[PDB]
TrEMBL record, chain B:
Species for this entry: Yarrowia lipolytica (Candida lipolytica)
Highest rank taxon of the organism: Eukaryota
This protein's name: Uncharacterized protein
Automatic annotation (TrEMBL), chain F:
Name recorded for this polypeptide: Uncharacterized protein
Spans annotated as Disordered: 37-59
Residues shown, of full length: 80 to 138 of 139
Organism encoding this protein: Yarrowia lipolytica
Domain of life: Eukaryota
TrEMBL record, chain G:
Gene name per UniProt: nucm
Protein name: NUCM protein
Family named by the database record: Belongs to the complex I 49 kDa subunit family.
Highest taxon, organism lineage: Eukaryota
Residues of the full protein shown: 29 to 78 of 466
TrEMBL record, chain H:
Highest taxon above the source species: Eukaryota
Record keywords, A-Z: Membrane, Transmembrane, Transmembrane helix, Ubiquinone
Species: Yarrowia lipolytica
Domain NADH-ubiquinone oxidoreductase 21kDa subunit N-terminal intervals: 17-102
Membrane-spanning residues: 39-59, 71-91
A Pfam family annotated for this UniProt entry: NADH_u_ox_C
InterPro entries associated with the record: NADH-Q_oxidrdct_subunit, NADH-UbQ_OxRdtase_su21_C_fun, NADH-UbQ_OxRdtase_su21_N
Record-given protein name: NADH-ubiquinone oxidoreductase complex I, 21 kDa subunit-domain-containing protein
Domain NADH-ubiquinone oxidoreductase 21kDa subunit C-terminal fungi intervals: 121-164
Coiled-coil blocks: none
Length: 81, 64, 89, 183, 469, 59, 50, 168
């Protein structure tokens, strides 16, 4: 209990597992735009997707609501990991 | 009361002059007339805010 | 509204998908403003008013002063460097 | 006489063609030369719709100043530029083929007021109906278009002309703010 | 009386020399002080949320707009009191932080452009005023021409602001195409039921919102903020945010907006987890700008957001302003100085600051606890009054993600303290020259507002009640 | 002498509670065109654009 | 003078000395942050536009 | 004929606790009816800008040594002090027309002068050299322009019929 529960698994849902979770998710949103020192072309091909992805997202929404939730979970997965 | 509402804002002014001395690495009483300047300035701010609140209360009283 | 939407969308994708020079960005930005004008002026005609033409004669001026400002920004960028890169700023 | 009918759809096709020659060119001057071609195709459309005054304002300032400005910049500056090769630009094709469809159809969606999302699009194309032009004899002086712009900029919207003064002011101050190096 | 200043000073700066620039900025500072002191009795015009439409359905003058109109002059006095005044009288401190000749002109042209949006009714005043202020940011950025990063930053900001300006003009044109009028009150609550307007009004919103840092397009702004010099960026981070956010909040065109709710959540996620592993101080500081500008699309979803907004904006402006001025003080004590335009770059560099002086770290501690919402501070009631409106109007998952975002954000706010209270090995025993008196009195006053604003919280609520209802 | 000094405070808090309920109802109350917009020029009615105007346009 | 600089998580961050602005360190691909080699150092400009 | 309003306008719609005279005062009227306590504010503002600059360099001098600023800046301080004093002067004196401040000695003068030009038979406000549509437009511009004194100066020079008064 003092090693497999108190220090083992209640820190995985505590300050040890969340340190690694935030380390991974921060590293991915940092590396969103890593290379391509042409930052103008890199930010400019990003403005197009974020008026296309939203524009298809709303089309998918107003036919059925349930089929955008896995889309949004998968966008969080590709964005944060 | 108006008087305590002046004294408290003047005490905020004394705190501004004190902390501004202490960032500059001066002693507590460095330019001890500057406490009078800040006290009068922030007390005047208390005058202003006190009178605005008075007039706002009277506008609410006249709506009945 | 076809000619305005087509200039806007195709000028926009000409802005987005360059990697070769800096001036194609400027001229695609300028033709986007043209594409907005082509839609606005026909809505002025078909509704019988000048007020879309009012916004037209204002946005002509703002496109002008936009070009003046932005090309002085480019000469700032070029003075300190030697040659404007191919890939971009 | 109905050779003289398709004149608008012609210039639409010419504008499509002309932007294809904007974004696919070798020199950086060839692109602005097709751009002044695009301005004059536009000015032909603006005369065609019933606006003779604007077309000449577009010639005055758009193949007027800002043309000469861009031609000038491309002269006295060196700018490296690659060609439209397939090995560097075919990777963008499956995004372009999505965004063409989506951005065009969505840009033709908002002219409608139904709530079906297929009757919204089909009101953009379902317009082959000829407006009827009556003669009303109510107007007495030739207040053309430019008179009314000069009446609305000067009385009803004098503040927009007067903020506009500050914008042109800024367009004078800015290049002297930058490109001088005082002392 | 901005233009009475601008027209006068532009002739005055045209003839003065390069040495006179400091004293010109001192003059303009004192001028703005006395415009705030001798002319601030115009609050009496409204007494029951009375709104005036001036210049003929073109400008709109109400009291929300009067408060923003007063807030911008106050923060401009604090910004202009930086360029006017020397930090120390040394060789380094003269060659650092030099104001250019045309800088003081471009500030007030930007304030004209920022005020004519919050006061704006027509779309054409909207468009001309976003253009005026966008130019002024193009040129406030590029005025330090002999900097490599600043020129690259101005050229990036140019094209991104240009795309979002054409997106706004497309939305304005499109609303004109579906309804003849330009004014927002042609809506008057009967249109929106019988008219599909949701797509137009969101594209008008998203056009301004993406100019500010709404988080799918957050990467370019962080780069511009890290690349400009450290004094351009306090101004160009404060001003466009508060100017257009009080526009979009005064005119509630996107209620229940699903796109706005998604991008609000995405902002609160990626800001609070983007600032986590970052070693540069202006970066950390700009993502603290991003999460806090994403407690804004939230109130933009609401109806009747004028206690939560205004309280949180003046909270955020004081807190923002104070922590930039803290690191501008902190550059004297650091051991390494690079990059003349941007002297402190890393948050590793302000180590051991408590052993240099303790009261600057006392100041830094109260501001960093005010960002994370610590209850006896003024920054707490801002989040409290956001949450008394989020939960008031049905946004429950928004509230949970707001809380989790605040907790993840506090982790990189407290890194500033973790660095600044540590052992340094090289303590200062005697500084020969001392920092400028007025420029440290300004920070002391901005602290004592933060730490003692809960005193006057109750007066503000009663005043508010009279003057907006 | 303490139950009375509580009744005073509880009246002083119920007064503030009723003050809040009022001032939260006074926000959502709809407002005139003369209070909300331009005080003089109280009509919304245009007569806009009178130079080449036609008799029979009013309704 | 500390052995391990921290980085708001359990991570190692580079202690940026004068020695990070070299011709070797120029043009190493990396995100806009966690990076050294500013383009504007008094050692990097080397009296440019002379 | 050149004095018919032909728009609809609120009548005696007071902006404060006191009765309005006037919805936009003509510039000559504002300079007429202002109190001596108002010329006070003009003088205090012309005094506060050069003394304000000399004070603000007594705090921290520009070149490290306390020297008086040059006469060159004291002249510009005097000019912009007259500018702030006139802005505060016009702003005060036209709050008195709106009935939002204390309105005692000017409601009597506006009984007096309006009654004294109803006896001379002329127009109650004055004949402008404008068509009545330009009077309407030019006074939709100058209505309530005293708010926004913080941005831009705008005044009434138009001499149009309507002022929110009882009959005309
Ligand atoms: C300090 C005071 C400000 C200067 C005052 C000088 C004017 C004056 O005293 O004349 C008294 C004089 C008194 O005559 P009156 O017999 O008693 O009655 C007038 C009649 O009713 C008038 O006859 P009417 O009723 O039939 O109406 C017709 C009238 C209709 O006239 C109008 O309706 C014009 C309305 C426009 C008002 C303009 C306000 C200014 C806006 C400032 C910029 C805002 C920027 C915002 C940008 C964002 O037409 C005119 O009379 C036009 C005369 C044109 C002369 C042009 C003189 C140029 C001087 C420019 C100076 C600028 C720099 C000064 C600062 C240094 O008034 C006039 O005759 C008309 C003066 C109109 C000139 C406006 C000049 C505005 C410049 C001031 C702005 C800067 C300072 C603020
Ligand atoms: C409700 C209560 C249940 C709480 C559950 C989780 C609470 C866990 C918690 O707060 O300790 C936090 C971890 O957490 C977060 O990393 C960030 C704390 C925010 C997590 C938000 C709480 C999530 C609740 C989800 C529902 C402590 O981080 P930590 O010291 O290891 O992280 C580092 C690390 O140790 C070293 O870099 C230094 O010590 C220092 O830089 C430090 O920041
Ligand atoms: C810069 C360059 C300029 C480029 C110009 C070229 C194009 C420009 C257009 C793009 C402009 C920028 C686009 C911005 C994003 C668009 C914003 C947007 O989605 O609004 C959608 C419109 O719902 C469609 O009907 C959306 C359906 C649209 C049709 C989908 C597209 C068809 C693709 C076919 C494949 C809805 O918003 P919203 O959350 O308020 O809507 C909610 C929600 O709909 C309801 O359930 C709620 O009850 C209600 O409260 C309401 O608020
Ligand atoms: C704006 C001010 C406030 C910003 C934040 C707002 C707070 C809300 C309102 C606050 C109300 C402010 C009222 C002004 C307060 C007036 C006031 O105390 O005297 C000043 C501060 O004077 C400003 O620093 C003047 C402050 C800035 C104004 C610059 C132009 C004057 C106190 O300096 P101080 O005695 O230590 O300065 C001393 C002293 O003058 C001599 O020993 C030496 O000559 C000198 O070198 C220095 O050591
Ligand atoms: C003698 C001067 C010496 C030189 C000083 C120069 C500049 C001083 C500038 C600012 C000092 C702080 C004054 C705050 C005024 C707030 C008015 C107001 O609460 O606004 C309310 C509505 O606010 C809101 O919605 C919410 C705002 C929430 C504020 C959050 C932070 C407040 C906590 C500290 C602020 C109070 C500290 C008092 C210190 C004694 C509207 O009422 P109002 O517009 O009629 O008030 C202005 C009347 N006036 C012009 C005559 C003063």
């Amino acid at each position: 209990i003092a090693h497999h529960v108190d220090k083992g698994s209640l820190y995985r849902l505590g300050p040890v597992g969340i340190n690694r979770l935030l380390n991974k998710a921060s590293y991915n949103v940092i590396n969103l735009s890593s290379n391509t020192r042409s930052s103008l072309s890199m930010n400019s091909m990003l403005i197009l997707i974020t008026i296309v992805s939203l524009l298809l997202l709303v089309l998918v929404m107003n036919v059925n609501f349930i089929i955008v939730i896995p889309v949004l979970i998968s966008i969080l997965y590709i964005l944060f990991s | 009361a108006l008087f305590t509402s002046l004294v408290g804002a003047s005490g905020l002014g004394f705190a501004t002059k004190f902390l501004s001395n202490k960032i500059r690495l001066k002693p507590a009483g460095y330019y001890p007339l500057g406490y009078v300047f800040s006290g009068v300035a922030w007390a005047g701010l208390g005058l202003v805010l006190h009178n605005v609140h008075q007039h706002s209360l009277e506008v609410l009283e006249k709506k009945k | 509204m076809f000619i305005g939407t087509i200039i806007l969308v195709l000028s926009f994708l000409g802005f987005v998908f360059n990697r070769r020079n800096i001036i194609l960005a400027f001229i695609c930005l300028e033709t986007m403003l043209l594409g907005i004008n082509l839609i606005l002026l026909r809505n002025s005609v078909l509704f019988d008013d000048i007020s879309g033409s009012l916004f037209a004669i204002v946005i002509i001026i703002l496109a002008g002063v936009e070009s003046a400002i932005g090309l002085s920004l480019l000469v700032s960028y070029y003075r300190l460097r030697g040659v404007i890169n191919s890939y971009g700023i | 006489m109905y050779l003289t009918y398709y004149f608008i759809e012609i210039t639409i096709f010419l504008a499509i063609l002309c932007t294809i020659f904007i974004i696919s060119a070798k020199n950086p001057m060839v692109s602005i030369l097709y751009m002044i071609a695009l301005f004059v195709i536009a000015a032909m459309y603006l005369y065609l719709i019933g606006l003779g005054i604007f077309s000449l304002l577009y010639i005055m300032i758009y193949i007027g100043a800002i043309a000469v400005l861009f031609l000038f910049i491309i002269t006295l500056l060196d700018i490296n530029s690659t060609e439209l090769s397939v090995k560097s630009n075919i990777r963008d094709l499956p995004l372009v083929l999505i965004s063409l469809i989506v951005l065009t159809i969505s840009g033709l969606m908002i002219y409608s007021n139904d709530s079906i999302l297929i009757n919204k699009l089909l009101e953009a194309f379902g317009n082959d109906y000829n407006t009827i032009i009556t003669q009303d004899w109510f107007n007495i002086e030739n207040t053309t278009l430019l008179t009314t712009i000069g009446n609305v900029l000067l009385t009803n919207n004098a503040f927009i002309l007067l903020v506009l003064a500050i914008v042109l002011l800024l367009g004078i101050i800015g290049p002297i703010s930058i490109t001088m190096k005082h002392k | 009386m901005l233009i009475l200043a601008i027209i006068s000073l532009i002739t005055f700066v045209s003839m003065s020399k390069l040495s006179d620039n400091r004293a010109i900025i001192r003059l303009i500072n004192i001028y703005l002080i006395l415009v705030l002191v001798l002319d601030s009795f115009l609050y009496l015009l409204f007494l029951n949320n009375q709104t005036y439409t001036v210049m003929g359905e073109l400008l709109i003058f109400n009291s929300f707009t009067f408060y923003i109109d007063m807030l911008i002059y106050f923060i401009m006095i604090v910004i202009s009191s930086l360029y006017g005044y020397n930090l120390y009288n040394n060789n380094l401190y003269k060659t650092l932080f030099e104001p250019k000749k045309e800088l003081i002109i471009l500030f007030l042209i930007n304030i004209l452009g920022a005020l004519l949006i919050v006061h704006s009714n027509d779309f054409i005043t909207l468009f001309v005023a976003i253009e005026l202020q966008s130019y002024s940011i193009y040129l406030i950025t590029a005025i330090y021409n002999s900097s490599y990063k600043a020129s690259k930053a101005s050229m990036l900001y140019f094209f991104m602001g240009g795309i979002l300006s054409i997106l706004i003009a497309y939305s304005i044109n499109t609303y004109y195409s579906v309804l003849n009028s330009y004014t927002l009150h042609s809506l008057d609550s009967l249109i929106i039921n019988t008219l599909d307007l949701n797509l137009i009004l969101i594209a008008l919103s998203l056009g301004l919102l993406f100019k500010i840092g709404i988080a799918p397009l957050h990467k370019w702004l962080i780069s511009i903020y890290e690349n400009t010099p450290i004094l351009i960026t306090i101004y160009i981070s404060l001003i466009p945010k508060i100017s257009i956010l009080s526009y979009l909040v005064l005119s509630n065109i996107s209620i229940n907006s699903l796109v706005i709710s998604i991008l609000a959540i995405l902002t609160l996620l990626v800001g609070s987890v983007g600032g986590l592993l970052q070693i540069k101080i202006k970066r950390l500081l700009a993502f603290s700008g991003l999460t806090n500008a994403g407690y804004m699309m939230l109130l933009l979803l609401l109806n009747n957001n004028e206690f939560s907004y205004l309280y949180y904006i003046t909270q955020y402006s004081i807190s923002h302003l104070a922590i930039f001025m803290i690191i501008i003080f902190s550059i004297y004590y650091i051991n390494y100085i690079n990059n003349q335009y941007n002297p402190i770059i890393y948050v590793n560099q302000l180590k051991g600051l408590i052993h240099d002086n303790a009261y600057l770290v006392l100041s830094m501690a109260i501001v960093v606890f005010s960002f994370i919402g610590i209850p006896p501070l003024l920054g707490f009631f801002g989040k409290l009054n956001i949450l008394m409106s989020i939960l008031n109007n049905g946004y429950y998952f928004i509230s949970i993600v707001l809380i989790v975002a605040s907790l993840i954000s506090a982790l990189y706010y407290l890194y500033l303290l973790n660095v600044s209270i540590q052992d340094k090995n090289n303590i200062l025993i005697n500084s020969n020259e001392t920092v400028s008196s007025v420029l440290s009195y300004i920070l002391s006053s901005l602290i004592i507002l933060i730490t003692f604003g809960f005193i006057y919280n109750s007066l503000i609520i009663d005043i508010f009640n009279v003057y907006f209802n | 002498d303490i139950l009375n000094e509580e009744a005073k405070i509880v009246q002083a808090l119920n007064n503030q509670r009723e003050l809040t309920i009022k001032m939260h109802e006074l926000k959502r109350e709809e407002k005139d065109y003369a209070h909300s917009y331009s005080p003089l020029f109280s009509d919304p009615v245009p007569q806009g654009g009178s130079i080449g105007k036609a008799p029979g346009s009013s309704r | 003078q500390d052995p391990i600089p921290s980085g708001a998580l359990g991570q190692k961050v580079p202690h940026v000395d004068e020695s990070h602005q070299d011709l070797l360190f120029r043009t190493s691909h990396m995100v806009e942050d966690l990076e050294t080699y500013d383009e504007d150092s008094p050692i990097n400009t080397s009296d440019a536009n002379t | 004929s050149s004095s018919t309003p032909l728009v609809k306008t609120s009548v005696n719609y007071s902006y404060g606790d006191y009765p309005l005279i006037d919805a936009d005062p003509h510039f000559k009227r504002v300079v007429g009816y202002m109190r001596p306590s108002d010329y006070g504010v003009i003088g205090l503002a012309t005094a506060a800008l050069p003394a304000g600059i000399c004070f603000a360099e007594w705090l921290d001098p520009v070149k490290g040594k306390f020297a008086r600023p040059s006469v060159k800046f004291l002249r510009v301080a005097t000019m912009l002090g007259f500018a702030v004093g006139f802005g505060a002067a016009y702003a005060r004196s036209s709050l008195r027309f709106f009935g939002v401040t204390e309105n005692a000695r000017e409601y009597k003068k506006d009984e007096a002068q309006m009654a004294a030009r109803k006896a001379a038979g002329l127009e109650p406000y004055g004949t402008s050299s404008l068509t009545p549509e330009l009077q309407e437009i030019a006074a939709k511009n100058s209505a309530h322009s005293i708010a926004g004194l913080f941005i831009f100066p705008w005044f009434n020079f138009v001499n149009h019929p309507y002022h929110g008064r009882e009959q005309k």
